[PDB]
Amino acid sequence: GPKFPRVKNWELGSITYDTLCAQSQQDGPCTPRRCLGSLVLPRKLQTRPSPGPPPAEQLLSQARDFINQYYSSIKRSGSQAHEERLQEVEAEVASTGTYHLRESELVFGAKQAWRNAPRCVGRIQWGKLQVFDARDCSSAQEMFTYICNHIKYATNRGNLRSAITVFPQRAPGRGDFRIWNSQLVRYAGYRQQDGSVRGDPANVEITELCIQHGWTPGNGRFDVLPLLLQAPDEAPELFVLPPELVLEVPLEHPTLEWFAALGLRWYALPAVSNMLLEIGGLEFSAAPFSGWYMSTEIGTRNLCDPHRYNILEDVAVCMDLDTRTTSSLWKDKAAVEINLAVLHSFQLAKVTIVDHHAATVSFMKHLDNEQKARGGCPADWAWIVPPISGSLTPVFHQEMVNYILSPAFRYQPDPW
Amino acid sequence: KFPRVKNWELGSITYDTLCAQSQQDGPCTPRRCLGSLVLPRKLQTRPSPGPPPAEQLLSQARDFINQYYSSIKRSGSQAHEERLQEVEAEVASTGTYHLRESELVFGAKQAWRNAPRCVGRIQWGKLQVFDARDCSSAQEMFTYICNHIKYATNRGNLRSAITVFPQRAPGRGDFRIWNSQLVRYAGYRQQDGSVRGDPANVEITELCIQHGWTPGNGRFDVLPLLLQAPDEAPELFVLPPELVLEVPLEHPTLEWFAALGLRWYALPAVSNMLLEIGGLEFSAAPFSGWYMSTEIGTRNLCDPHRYNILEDVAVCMDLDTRTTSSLWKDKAAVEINLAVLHSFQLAKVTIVDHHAATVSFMKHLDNEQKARGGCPADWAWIVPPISGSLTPVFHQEMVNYILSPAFRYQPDPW
Ligand code: HEM
Ligand code: HEM
Ligand SMILES: N=C(N)NCCCC[C@H](N)C(=O)O
Ligand SMILES: N=C(N)NCCCC[C@H](N)C(=O)O
Ligand SMILES: [Zn+2]
């Protein structure tokens, strides 16, 4: 039959063919010899600093392609405006070596990038993104203003709205606009003498980096870190977020009265700030985006990973579970209650959140929409299936083809 | 050339050099990753009506033999040299060859070791290999299968085993076991599409009744075996009940659980896969070990397209099945898995939970890193269906690739 990957759903027995992957203009880590699809950071997309301006030839075909996607999207492919915009980009790359995006094009690409993200299970919301254009930004101080504006609009007092702020693209031989923090909001990770980490172990490097840059470190388990903002060709500057802007949710359990006493909490706004936004060849090194959490992110990964808060044992001890034998499923039991606590605490606080069941169901809906609209949907199985109750969600039984489409969000090396 | 493999829990890294030995292609390409797919679109095992290019067969053979002699520290020895020549000799003359019992035993063990989707590979060295190549009838396969089951079950103290029937022969039909497992519960489609029993076995059940099997009418009716000898119609054989050990399911504290009347069989014995060694193919080589609790408690009993007992348990647990955020599914899945573990332990039948199983697999990875410089593993299949990131394997990157000897899927005989 069809000469594209055959994708099957084992729960429903249905079949589909992905023809969209034929559009993938970039390779991944896989080869007929071995599958490296479980690797978190395979050296493939990696947007390593390529300082010396890019092959005018390469950037052109990448730009020619994006512009086609844009006119296609507004149903004007082949129009006079399309060709003119085409000649316009070529000319500008001819004389300056680079080019710029019109307002509407930036909005279109930001959305496509989210739309194209293989690891995002919340893409059914892709068409509803607020795009803040901050391409005029020219100082670390100004970056801080936009970021604060972003957090204010995105948080919206608990009724969270997806958003993205776009700072100046990379320029020939010039410094990049960079946000050193991985997320606009993160908790400190303090390296202790005995060797342990107080707070979040994932943020130890960035925590010390702030200290080295003048931040007076605290000593709590949930200290909100300051932002290290770097304008072109300048050392990063330090900025502390107005506490009132950072909305947090204390965690309590619906029926375990002692859980609230654990003093656990989490911030409501998940805002990735270290990824690179790539559109038509142009690279936006600073372009923080945010949506709203899926309960397992906080409840299972953040609070229970061995290398994070690792609270599983403490909660199980409080639940009086037999933690000396794997077969008592003490880990499974404590993980459930903790996730329940997170969901319950957000609903009480009236802060937007979605459980892993609702989330995956809507992603199945998104896959159907995309099958029709584009002939497929790039998806990373290991990342789409939740960290708990995997097979209990519909995505587990859905095969998925993973590949890279552009516009795209890519990982980039740390500025330091 | 050599992939870096990281464990995000410990920050450790390793380089997989074993994949260089991979001589078989997967479904992945630089353009897109199809690793989440269960069955190969082309990596099948096409017919054997005409011999296989001697060039090909011969090279796989020389490689396997070389493998076999390295394993017993007699590489380049005299015996080794004379074995290669025997194989060269037989192939040139008949277009095929035959393995010696000891090579077969070695090959079977390696096939399991190379099984990317198996989490219990730490046991790969402990496998009882029954040579059943001296089989000429379906009636004989049945006695062999019965002995395998008796031995493997060992009154609850399960022991891993494999039984190897005659290899495929060009132009001749295959010895086949139609059933996917030696023990499966019938799936009876009612009238209105619903199904009584295991929905996964509807087809095999229908084929049985179509060959003279008198169907039962329960949810856990042990199916008969449809054994087939070359170019013959499959024959029906019912398994002696005293031979099929089962475990009634009950819960530690929830007195009512037993009411549900749920049960499962002790022996997980796959029978529709193909064993390949030195280019030779064993179309009927049933193998077995013991269950990991999740296969039963999560997949077989909770999958939507399987027994799908999730809602019944939740209602009995008097949980709020009105909304998803109540995590009633997660809570009920946990108790059902606890019940399987409890029930199996009570009945003194071997079983391993997913926490213990994945811990042992991590050790296997390390053992294999030193022994071969890598270990082919399929992440999606190695990480359990529940409590994924709560186990060490979730946080471990993995490389998937095909090594031979190997167990492979093959077309359905009908
Ligand atoms: C509206 C709610 C949204 C939900 C609930 C959602 C949920 C998720 C989840 C569960 C992941 C994986 C998290 C992890 O395992 O670390 C993810 C990844 C991702 N999401 Fe979404 N997402 C949403 C909004 C957004 C938005 C607004 C964008 C971009 C404009 C976006 C872009 C991405 C990207 C790029 C990744 C992968 C990041 C990485 O590689 O670490 N998401 N999302
Ligand atoms: C000692 C106990 C064993 C345990 C606990 C174990 C556990 C598992 C599990 C959980 C899977 C995935 C099952 C699924 O999701 O359908 C698996 C797959 C597999 N195992 Fe094992 N295993 C054991 C013994 C064996 C033995 C003795 C062999 C062969 C000699 C073997 C060969 C395989 C193969 C080929 C697969 C993949 C089957 C497929 O593609 O569907 N395993 N094992
Ligand atoms: N819900 C969203 N938008 N998630 C984006 C992923 C990064 C958040 C991270 N997993 C965390 O738990 O903080
Ligand atoms: N534990 C073992 N040996 N598993 C092998 C796979 C076949 C069993 C299947 N998953 C089932 O649930 O029946
Ligand atoms: Zn792959």
Curated annotation (Swiss-Prot), chain A:
The modification Phosphoserine is found at S50. It comes from the Eukaryota. Residues 34-416 are annotated as: Interaction with NOSIP. (6R)-L-erythro-5,6,7,8-tetrahydrobiopterin binds at S38, A382, W383, F396. L-arginine binds at Q183, W292, Y293, E297, N302. Heme b binds at C120, Y411. It is found in: Cell membrane; Membrane, Caveola; Cytoplasm, Cytoskeleton; Golgi apparatus. Zn(2+) binds at C30, C35. Homodimer. Interacts with NOSIP and NOSTRIN. Interacts with HSP90AB1. Forms a complex with ASL, ASS1 and SLC7A1; the complex regulates cell-autonomous L-arginine synthesis and citrulline recycling while channeling extracellular L-arginine to nitric oxide synthesis pathway. Belongs to the NOS family. Produces nitric oxide (NO) which is implicated in vascular smooth muscle relaxation through a cGMP-mediated signal transduction pathway. NO mediates vascular endothelial growth factor (VEGF)-induced angiogenesis in coronary vessels and promotes blood clotting through the activation of platelets. This is Nitric oxide synthase 3. The gene is NOS3. The chain holds residues 67 to 482 of 1205 of the full protein.
